Design a protein around this nucleic acid. Sequence first.
RNA 1: AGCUUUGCGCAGUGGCAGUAUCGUAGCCAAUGAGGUUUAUCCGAGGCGCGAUUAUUGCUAAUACUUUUCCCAAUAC
Lengths: 135, 71, 49
Amino acid sequence: VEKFGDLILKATEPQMVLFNLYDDWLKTISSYTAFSRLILILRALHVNNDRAKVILKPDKTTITEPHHIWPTLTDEEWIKVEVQLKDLILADYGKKNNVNVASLTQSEIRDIILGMEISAPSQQRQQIQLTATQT
Amino acid sequence: RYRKMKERLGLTEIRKQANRMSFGEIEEDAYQEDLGFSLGHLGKSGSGRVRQTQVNEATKARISKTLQRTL
Amino acid sequence: AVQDPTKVEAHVRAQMAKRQKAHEEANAARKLTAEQRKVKKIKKLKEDI
RNA sequence: AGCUUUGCGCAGUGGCAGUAUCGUAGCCAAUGAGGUUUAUCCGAGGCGCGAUUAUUGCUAAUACUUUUCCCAAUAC
């Protein structure tokens, strides 16, 4: 987020500071809905940080006042922007892993959003029609 | 109800840690009255964690409902 | 809630509001009207003649 | 005309415990069940039997190939 970067990159004399990522969300949404929204937004910013920057401004007004960090947006539009953000994360995962986004299961999407997924090397062996042979 | 009963019978970290036993690190035989009684990685300075483990409140012994009404 | 948190929370609160609305309309469909309360009190206080 | 008490229903929001919940065309019981303390005193259920995940219901987790077209003269 460019506020954090503009602060830290041009700061000296190390000092503690306090923020709040639930800008005005707690007035209308719960705590672990705010956390899930934050996780989605942060995963997106980890994915692109520029496409999600455009998604975070669905209009050109997009009043992100200096009083807080996230744009002042309504819950009904929050649902739509969350859908677009989820689509972005899935599209990037599919692009990088050559998978099909429609083929992902529910728990697959949950694991994609939360953390990461385990691979499978060739050294991992599952050693755990009939052709008769005379010997 | 299922969550509470599973948490009560669940294997707590302190009870999980008493299940283990170090390999080749011989413990002193505390508790004369019964040899073979040994805590696991509870305090043996083996491979556990730095801080002491905490008692789970769900394992605290409680009395019955009929016993309470008689009390 | 991991996938669409705001939509899920809105659905949950819609269910909560539906339950509260059902409770309140059940209370309202029985609530005694002011005319009915008055006539009830008057009839209870009248009949000892 | 509000305020408020008791009991009973319908709900809603919570909290607590799964060694207990329910049944009783079985028996006994305020014409007295049970009495360890407070006994010339207290005052209700008790016993036997039965069901059970120690109340009972749901919901979900534990998967892909049927089809249907073909070679030929500007000639004794």
